[PDB]
Amino acid sequence: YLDDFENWTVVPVETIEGINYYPNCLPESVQRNLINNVPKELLSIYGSGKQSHLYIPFPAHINCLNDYIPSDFKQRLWKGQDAEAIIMQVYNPGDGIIPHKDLEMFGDGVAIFSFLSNTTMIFTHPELKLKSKIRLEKGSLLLMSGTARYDWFHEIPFRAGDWVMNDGEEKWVSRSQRLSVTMRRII
Ligand SMILES: [Fe+3]
């Protein structure tokens, strides 16, 4: 991310080893139970979205998310175990995050559950001069590991909508408030 990238190519996210995306992973009931039980202050629609760090033991409305993370992922990367460290982050329209790689204190395998509304995440590789985009939908799970987690940067653009292609038309879809829950372990 430094703009306008004419030397660069946009590739399918399927080319990035260690991206696994599961649409409609969480039932609506699970999403509503979670949202109902976040402190109301965290969900303010005004100004920049707030954030909350949680650590074991998590309450049931959070802790249940561990059950929707694929067992093969936890076996391969988390020594069969469940998440230890969780950040809940709200994004009001215009909020995002600059390109980064998650801190080395976390080791491999990062799980991100999405709530409330859809957004677009962009992966960047400066050395390859490549970009890739993924639409993170309400109720989805993103797993980031390996090449995705170490070689590439990820970001969420600071804007109020996203151009989204569907059924051959491209629309500007305004963003609504979004909440993510990021689940990690500590080395
Ligand atoms: Fe990150």
Side-chain angles (χ1 to χ4, degrees), residues 51 54 56 132 147 156-157 160:
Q51 131 182 328
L54 316 164
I56 308 164
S132 190
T147 300
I156 293 165

Side-chain angles (χ1 to χ4, degrees), residues 7 40 56 58 60 71 79 87 108 133 138 140 157 164 186:
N7 286 357
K40 257 63 191 175
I56 308 164
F58 311 121
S71 170
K79 292 215 295 304
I87 300 297
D108 205 355
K133 305 167 185 162
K138 169 182 126 57
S140 69
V164 173
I186 314 293

Side-chain angles (χ1 to χ4, degrees), residues 9-17 19 123 130-134 152:
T9 300
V10 189
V11 293
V13 79
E14 286 81 8
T15 67
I16 306 178
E17 182 283 315
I19 288 173
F123 293 86
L130 299 177
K131 296 284 209 178
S132 190
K133 305 167 185 162
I134 186 161
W152 286 76

Side-chain angles (χ1 to χ4, degrees), residues 5-178:
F5 306 107
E6 288 78 11
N7 286 357
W8 292 55
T9 300
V10 189
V11 293
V13 79
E14 286 81 8
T15 67
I16 306 178
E17 182 283 315
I19 288 173
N20 297 96
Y21 174 76
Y22 303 90
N24 306 126
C25 174
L26 300 177
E28 296 267 24
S29 68
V30 171
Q31 295 176 49
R32 275 195 305 270
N33 188 63
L34 186 144
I35 291 302
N36 286 351
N37 283 296
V38 311
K40 257 63 191 175
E41 28 276 314
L42 182 70
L43 293 178
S44 174
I45 62 158
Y46 299 109
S48 282
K50 288 154 166 20
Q51 131 182 328
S52 186
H53 294 245
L54 316 164
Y55 306 98
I56 308 164
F58 311 121
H61 62 272
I62 297 312
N63 190 232
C64 67
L65 291 179
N66 284 295
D67 306 317
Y68 289 86
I69 301 182
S71 170
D72 57 15
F73 172 102
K74 298 193 253 193
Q75 292 161 30
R76 180 177 41 110
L77 304 173
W78 283 5
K79 292 215 295 304
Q81 318 275 16
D82 279 347
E84 295 172 308
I86 292 184
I87 300 297
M88 297 202 288
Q89 178 76 52
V90 177
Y91 297 85
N92 294 322
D95 291 337
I97 181 150
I98 64 141
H100 64 289
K101 290 173 183 177
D102 285 7
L103 307 175
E104 301 309 330
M105 75 170 282
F106 294 121
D108 205 355
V110 177
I112 303 164
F113 287 105
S114 288
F115 304 82
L116 301 174
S117 64
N118 298 171
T119 197
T120 298
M121 169 169 285
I122 293 171
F123 293 86
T124 297
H125 203 310
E127 196 168 43
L128 306 181
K129 290 160 286 199
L130 299 177
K131 296 284 209 178
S132 190
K133 305 167 185 162
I134 186 161
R135 189 76 173 155
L136 299 180
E137 314 159 273
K138 169 182 126 57
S140 69
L141 166 63
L142 179 64
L143 301 177
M144 273 193 290
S145 60
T147 300
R149 185 266 182 270
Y150 290 117
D151 284 11
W152 286 76
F153 294 88
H154 57 271
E155 78 186 279
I156 293 165
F158 297 87
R159 50 200 197 202
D162 304 285
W163 290 93
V164 173
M165 178 81 74
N166 266 132
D167 318 288
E169 300 179 358
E170 221 195 343
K171 290 186 171 150
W172 199 80
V173 176
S174 294
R175 278 180 193 181
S176 293
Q177 188 177 59
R178 173 182 177 261

